């Protein structure tokens, strides 16, 4: 049964990119999906998305460009202890110059650089490069 | 960048439906074709010839755009296109290849078939598939005469025709030649039906 709703939305985006498309219709959207879509958009990796309101749970159309190689989800939302965030981005980012690990803290769903500046920590969501 | 009176003229529209260039393929119909226009019942699909015309215009606009008009290359192993291409070649720059292709023409300098163009035109990407393929080994843009069932991998700018036979491919090749001259070329102004008969291009007999 449908497990991480985030997961499907991310994976869908990645197969649109790979297949060279510019649009995705994801389903079923969520507070979290938006706030993840919201981060990527903030940093270039996708264009403009749009919530469509089926009276159900939602759909989203994402418009993307091609600045994006991969946007994955970390499927157990592990806990990260502000030291451990270094070791995450190391394992799964292409280099120290770009790309973000995005996680979830009490202080909000944010990428790790904002996490580092705000200096809070929490659970790990996924990543974008 | 829209010219002015490079719209589809009535004389051209007449020209096309006599050749039946709007008569696209049967049941068979490649996903990658919006060049359609309402299926005629009893298994025939009518073709938006304005787009045919509008693409023809682009075709010409790129054929003429190549510094030396002779390393633009026409191909047709299909007999119905050989007398066509030979004639297209004649009037414009363009080196012709009618008959058997002979593979290794584009890779392998060592061949005596060896060409090396900046652009390729083609009449039936099924039968001429060789050309289409070989060019993609070596970044050579491809123009193509396509029906509703033709394979559109590695051809850019489709010209929706009817390689079912008759006068269409001839017509299309003619108009191709007509408009390339009508660009930067040894032609003339308006209506200008152009001296050369369209039946000049054509497969002959018996």
């Amino acid at each position: 049964t449908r497990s991480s709703v985030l997961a499907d939305a991310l994976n869908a985006i990645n197969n649109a990119e790979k297949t060279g498309k510019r649009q995705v219709l994801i389903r079923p959207s969520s507070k979290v999906i938006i706030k993840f879509l919201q981060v990527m958009q903030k940093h270039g990796y996708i264009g403009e998305f749009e919530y469509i309101d089926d009276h159900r749970s939602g759909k989203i159309v994402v418009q993307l460009n091609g600045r994006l190689n991969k946007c994955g989800v970390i499927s157990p939302r592990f806990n990260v202890k502000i030291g451990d965030i270094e070791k995450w981005t190391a394992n799964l980012l292409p280099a120290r110059q770009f790309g973000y690990v995005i996680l979830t803290t009490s202080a909000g769903i944010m990428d790790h650089e904002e996490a580092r500046r705000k200096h809070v920590s929490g659970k790990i969501l996924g990543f974008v490069y | 960048s829209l010219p002015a009176t490079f719209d589809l003229t009535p004389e051209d529209a007449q020209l096309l439906l006599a050749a039946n260039t709007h008569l696209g393929a049967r049941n068979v119909q490649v996903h990658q074709e919006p060049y359609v226009f309402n299926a005629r019942p009893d298994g025939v699909h009518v073709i938006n010839v304005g787009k045919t015309w509008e693409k023809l215009v682009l075709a010409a606009r790129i054929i003429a755009a190549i510094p030396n008009p002779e390393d633009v290359v026409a191909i047709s192993s299909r007999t119905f296109g050989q007398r066509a291409v030979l004639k297209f070649a004649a009037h414009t720059g363009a080196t012709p290849i009618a008959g058997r292709f002979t593979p290794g023409s584009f890779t392998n300098y060592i061949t005596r078939s060896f060409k090396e163009p900046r652009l390729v035109i083609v009449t039936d990407p099924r039968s001429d598939a060789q050309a289409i393929k070989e060019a993609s080994y070596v970044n050579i843009p491809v123009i193509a005469l396509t029906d509703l069932d033709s394979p559109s991998e590695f051809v850019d700018v489709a010209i929706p025709c009817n390689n079912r036979g008759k006068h269409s491919i001839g017509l299309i090749w003619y108009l191709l030649a007509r408009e390339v001259l009508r660009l930067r070329g040894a032609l003339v102004d308006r209506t200008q039906p152009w001296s050369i008969m369209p039946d000049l291009y054509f497969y002959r007999d018996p």
């Binding site: 499927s75 157990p76 939302r77 592990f78 | -």
Partner: protein
């Protein structure tokens, strides 16, 4: 995801499976079964000293043809009897 539970609480299972499958490791199994201490002529220790029973002339394995000169030794801590080889030309003349 094939196999392994990816849950956040699935630690226990994930631990247990490992314990289970370490047994398919030749060395781990040897270590815990105490195979060393149990079987094995030496204690499990590096050397062992014993006493010479008979001088032997073991024929080598193919594709080699030879007589290999060995000694049946009866280990001192053990009584276990063992046949040992006597390295280098002659040397079997040093034993008795």
């Amino acid at each position: 995801g094939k196999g392994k539970p990816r849950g956040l609480n699935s630690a226990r299972k994930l631990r247990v499976h490992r314990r289970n499958n370490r047994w398919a490791e030749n060395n781990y199994k040897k270590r815990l079964l105490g195979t060393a201490f149990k079987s094995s002529p030496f204690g499990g220790s590096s050397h062992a000293k014993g006493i010479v029973l008979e001088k032997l002339g073991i024929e080598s394995k193919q594709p080699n043809s030879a007589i290999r000169k060995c000694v049946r030794v009866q280990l001192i801590k053990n009584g276990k009897k063992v046949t040992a080889f006597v390295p280098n030309d002659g040397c079997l003349n040093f034993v008795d």
